[PDB]
């Protein structure tokens, strides 16, 4: 536990100059947003309880992207 504590203190007190190489590579890329997608399902169909207009952001993400209609175990079995 003392090893934990001293390691965390060492990490905190130090000074850095960059993130990991991967993130520095990622920041070299920039994109461009455009017109919105097409609705995936009808806007007035309840799918998950609570995900409703009073719960805007999940509702909008779900209706824009659409639910995963295929089981994940079999999908990742081939990956």
């Amino acid at each position: 536990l003392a090893e934990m504590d001293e390691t965390l203190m060492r990490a905190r007190r130090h000074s850095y100059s960059s993130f990991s190489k991967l993130l520095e590579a990622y920041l070299l890329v920039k994109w461009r947003m455009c017109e919105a997608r097409e609705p995936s399902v009808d806007l007035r169909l309840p799918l998950c309880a609570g995900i409703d207009p009073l719960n805007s952001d999940p509702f909008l993400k779900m209706v824009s992207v659409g639910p995963m209609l295929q089981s994940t175990r079999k999908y990742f079995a081939q990956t």
Partner: peptide
């Protein structure tokens, strides 16, 4: 006071949506 309803809460947001 002003404990109006939950269904009207649902409908009011939708009415906000439909407006354009």
């Amino acid at each position: 006071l002003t404990s109006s309803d939950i269904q009207r809460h649902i409908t009011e947001f939708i009415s906000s949506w439909q407006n354009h």
